[PDB]
Amino acid sequence: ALDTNYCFRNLEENCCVRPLYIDFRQDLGWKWVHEPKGYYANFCSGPCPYLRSADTTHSTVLGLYNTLNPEASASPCCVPQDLEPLTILYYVGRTPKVEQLSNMVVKSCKCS
Amino acid sequence: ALDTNYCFRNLEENCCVRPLYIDFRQDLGWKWVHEPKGYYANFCSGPCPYLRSADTTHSTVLGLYNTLNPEASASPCCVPQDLEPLTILYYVGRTPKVEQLSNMVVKSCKCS
């Protein structure tokens, strides 16, 4: 499937992982989050040609229907598939808390 | 979550289920499939405003990041969530086969 390592060495217009660094404090406005200061959420973006890592069979039917009947604009989307969690530190009053939020960073995408 | 029954009584620009009837024979070109002749695959389509049935937390972060930093066009997509299978009949030579393909028709969508 298409993941970072791949989507990163080589560029693809079609569904692939795009890197994205978010900074909790700014563009998000999470001040409670005290550290790390930002992470690489990355995102999935790209058109989904017929067969490019399909999810369900419905995703295949669609991709196809769409392909040979373009008027459609029915096409399956490119979303994340695999995503690791992220750990962050914040304080409850003045006692630090280190927790790991799940699914904060994507690693692979897929046309669903 | 947004499913047919809902997305169908009321119209929504945002992520919802859209009905779609596909005909195996035509626009798909499956002749082997002998009956039914077509079904309602439906599809998911719509923008994903911040919070509209989010999938992962990453989907929330994104939706938000995206919301207050629109330049982004990062936004999470609207894909199917729940989908029932479909049964079809075809012949291996002249001996009918009734099988059920899984995930051929969507019922609910979600922003992922």
Coordinates of N, CA and C in Angstrom, one line a residue, chain B residues 6-91:
Chain B
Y6 N -31.4 8.8 6.9 CA -31.3 10.2 7.2 C -31.1 11.0 6.0
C7 N -29.9 10.8 5.4 CA -29.4 11.5 4.2 C -30.5 11.5 3.1
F8 N -31.4 10.6 3.2 CA -32.4 10.5 2.2 C -33.7 11.4 2.5
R9 N -34.2 11.4 3.7 CA -35.4 12.2 4.0 C -34.9 13.7 3.8
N10 N -33.8 14.0 4.4 CA -33.3 15.4 4.3 C -32.0 15.5 3.4
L11 N -32.0 16.6 2.7 CA -30.8 16.8 1.8 C -29.7 17.6 2.6
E12 N -28.5 17.2 2.3 CA -27.4 17.9 3.0 C -26.3 18.1 2.0
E13 N -25.7 19.3 2.0 CA -24.6 19.5 1.1 C -23.4 18.7 1.7
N14 N -23.3 18.8 3.0 CA -22.2 18.1 3.6 C -22.4 16.6 3.6
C15 N -21.2 16.0 3.8 CA -21.1 14.5 3.8 C -22.4 13.8 4.1
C16 N -22.9 13.1 3.2 CA -24.1 12.3 3.4 C -24.2 11.2 2.3
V17 N -25.1 10.3 2.4 CA -25.2 9.2 1.4 C -26.0 9.7 0.2
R18 N -25.4 9.5 -1.0 CA -26.1 9.9 -2.2 C -26.5 8.5 -2.9
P19 N -27.7 8.4 -3.4 CA -28.2 7.2 -4.0 C -27.5 7.0 -5.4
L20 N -27.2 5.8 -5.8 CA -26.7 5.6 -7.1 C -27.0 4.1 -7.5
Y21 N -27.6 4.0 -8.6 CA -28.0 2.7 -9.2 C -27.0 2.4 -10.2
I22 N -26.3 1.2 -10.1 CA -25.4 0.8 -11.1 C -26.0 -0.4 -11.8
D23 N -25.8 -0.5 -13.1 CA -26.3 -1.6 -13.9 C -25.0 -2.4 -14.4
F24 N -24.8 -3.5 -13.8 CA -23.6 -4.3 -14.2 C -23.3 -4.4 -15.6
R25 N -24.3 -4.7 -16.4 CA -24.2 -4.9 -17.9 C -23.6 -3.6 -18.5
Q26 N -24.4 -2.5 -18.4 CA -23.9 -1.3 -19.0 C -22.8 -0.8 -18.1
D27 N -22.6 0.6 -18.1 CA -21.6 1.3 -17.2 C -20.9 0.5 -16.1
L28 N -20.1 -0.5 -16.5 CA -19.5 -1.4 -15.6 C -19.0 -2.5 -16.4
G29 N -19.9 -3.0 -17.3 CA -19.6 -4.1 -18.2 C -19.3 -5.4 -17.6
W30 N -20.2 -5.8 -16.8 CA -20.1 -7.2 -16.2 C -21.2 -7.9 -16.9
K31 N -20.8 -8.8 -17.7 CA -21.9 -9.6 -18.4 C -22.1 -10.9 -17.7
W32 N -21.0 -11.4 -17.1 CA -21.1 -12.7 -16.4 C -22.2 -12.5 -15.4
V33 N -22.3 -11.4 -14.7 CA -23.4 -11.2 -13.8 C -24.7 -11.3 -14.6
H34 N -25.5 -12.2 -14.2 CA -26.7 -12.5 -14.9 C -28.0 -12.0 -14.3
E35 N -28.0 -11.7 -13.0 CA -29.2 -11.2 -12.3 C -28.8 -11.1 -10.9
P36 N -29.2 -10.1 -10.2 CA -30.1 -8.9 -10.5 C -29.4 -8.2 -11.6
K37 N -30.0 -7.2 -12.2 CA -29.4 -6.5 -13.3 C -28.6 -5.3 -12.9
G38 N -29.0 -4.8 -11.7 CA -28.3 -3.6 -11.2 C -28.7 -3.3 -9.8
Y39 N -27.9 -2.6 -9.0 CA -28.2 -2.4 -7.7 C -28.0 -1.0 -7.3
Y40 N -28.3 -0.6 -6.0 CA -28.0 0.8 -5.6 C -26.8 0.9 -4.8
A41 N -25.7 1.0 -5.5 CA -24.4 1.1 -4.8 C -24.4 2.4 -3.9
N42 N -24.9 3.5 -4.4 CA -24.9 4.7 -3.6 C -23.4 5.1 -3.5
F43 N -23.2 6.3 -3.0 CA -21.8 6.7 -2.8 C -21.7 7.8 -1.7
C44 N -20.5 8.1 -1.2 CA -20.5 9.2 -0.3 C -19.8 10.4 -0.9
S45 N -20.4 11.6 -0.7 CA -19.8 12.8 -1.3 C -20.3 13.9 -0.4
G46 N -19.4 14.9 -0.3 CA -19.8 16.1 0.6 C -18.5 16.6 1.2
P47 N -18.5 17.8 1.7 CA -17.4 18.4 2.3 C -17.4 18.0 3.7
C48 N -16.3 17.9 4.4 CA -16.3 17.5 5.8 C -16.0 18.6 6.8
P49 N -17.0 19.3 7.2 CA -16.9 20.4 8.2 C -16.3 19.8 9.4
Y50 N -15.8 20.7 10.3 CA -15.2 20.2 11.5 C -16.2 19.6 12.5
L51 N -16.0 18.3 12.7 CA -16.8 17.5 13.6 C -17.9 16.6 12.9
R52 N -18.3 16.9 11.7 CA -19.2 16.0 11.0 C -18.7 14.6 11.0
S53 N -19.3 13.7 11.8 CA -18.9 12.3 12.0 C -17.5 12.0 11.6
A54 N -16.6 12.3 12.5 CA -15.2 12.1 12.4 C -14.8 10.7 12.6
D55 N -13.7 10.2 12.0 CA -13.3 8.9 12.1 C -12.3 8.7 13.2
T56 N -11.1 9.1 13.0 CA -10.0 9.0 13.9 C -9.8 10.4 14.6
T57 N -8.9 10.5 15.5 CA -8.7 11.8 16.1 C -8.0 12.6 15.1
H58 N -7.2 11.9 14.3 CA -6.5 12.7 13.3 C -7.6 13.4 12.4
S59 N -8.7 12.7 12.2 CA -9.7 13.3 11.4 C -10.2 14.6 12.1
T60 N -10.2 14.6 13.4 CA -10.6 15.8 14.1 C -9.6 16.9 14.0
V61 N -8.4 16.6 14.3 CA -7.3 17.5 14.2 C -7.4 18.2 12.9
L62 N -7.4 17.4 11.8 CA -7.4 17.9 10.5 C -8.6 18.9 10.3
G63 N -9.8 18.4 10.5 CA -11.0 19.1 10.3 C -10.9 20.5 10.9
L64 N -10.3 20.5 12.1 CA -10.1 21.8 12.8 C -9.0 22.6 12.2
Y65 N -7.8 22.0 12.0 CA -6.6 22.7 11.4 C -7.1 23.4 10.2
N66 N -7.9 22.6 9.4 CA -8.4 23.0 8.2 C -9.4 24.1 8.4
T67 N -10.3 24.0 9.3 CA -11.3 25.0 9.6 C -10.6 26.4 9.9
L68 N -9.7 26.5 10.8 CA -9.2 27.7 11.1 C -7.8 27.9 10.5
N69 N -7.8 27.8 9.1 CA -6.6 27.9 8.3 C -7.0 27.3 6.9
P70 N -8.2 27.7 6.4 CA -8.8 27.3 5.2 C -7.9 27.1 4.0
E71 N -6.8 28.0 3.9 CA -5.8 28.0 2.8 C -5.4 26.5 2.5
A72 N -5.4 25.8 3.6 CA -5.1 24.4 3.8 C -5.7 23.5 2.7
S73 N -7.0 23.3 2.6 CA -7.6 22.4 1.7 C -7.0 21.0 2.0
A74 N -6.8 20.8 3.3 CA -6.3 19.6 3.9 C -7.4 18.7 4.2
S75 N -8.5 19.3 4.7 CA -9.8 18.6 4.9 C -9.9 17.1 4.7
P76 N -10.5 16.3 5.7 CA -10.7 14.9 5.7 C -11.9 14.6 4.7
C77 N -11.8 13.5 4.1 CA -12.9 13.1 3.1 C -14.1 12.4 3.6
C78 N -15.1 12.3 2.8 CA -16.3 11.7 3.1 C -16.4 10.3 2.5
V79 N -16.2 9.2 3.2 CA -16.2 7.9 2.7 C -17.3 7.1 3.3
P80 N -17.6 5.9 2.7 CA -18.6 5.0 3.3 C -18.1 4.5 4.6
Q81 N -19.1 4.1 5.5 CA -18.8 3.6 6.8 C -19.4 2.2 7.0
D82 N -20.6 2.1 6.7 CA -21.3 0.8 6.7 C -21.8 0.4 5.4
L83 N -21.6 -0.8 5.0 CA -22.1 -1.3 3.7 C -22.4 -2.8 3.7
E84 N -23.7 -3.0 3.3 CA -24.2 -4.4 3.2 C -23.7 -5.1 2.0
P85 N -23.8 -6.4 1.9 CA -23.3 -7.2 0.8 C -24.5 -7.3 -0.2
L86 N -24.1 -7.8 -1.4 CA -25.1 -8.0 -2.5 C -24.9 -9.4 -3.0
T87 N -26.1 -10.0 -3.4 CA -26.0 -11.4 -3.9 C -26.3 -11.3 -5.4
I88 N -25.7 -12.2 -6.1 CA -25.9 -12.1 -7.6 C -25.8 -13.6 -8.0
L89 N -26.4 -13.8 -9.2 CA -26.4 -15.1 -9.8 C -25.7 -15.2 -11.2
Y90 N -24.8 -16.1 -11.4 CA -24.2 -16.2 -12.6 C -24.0 -17.7 -12.9
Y91 N -23.5 -18.1 -14.1 CA -23.4 -19.5 -14.5 C -22.0 -19.9 -14.8

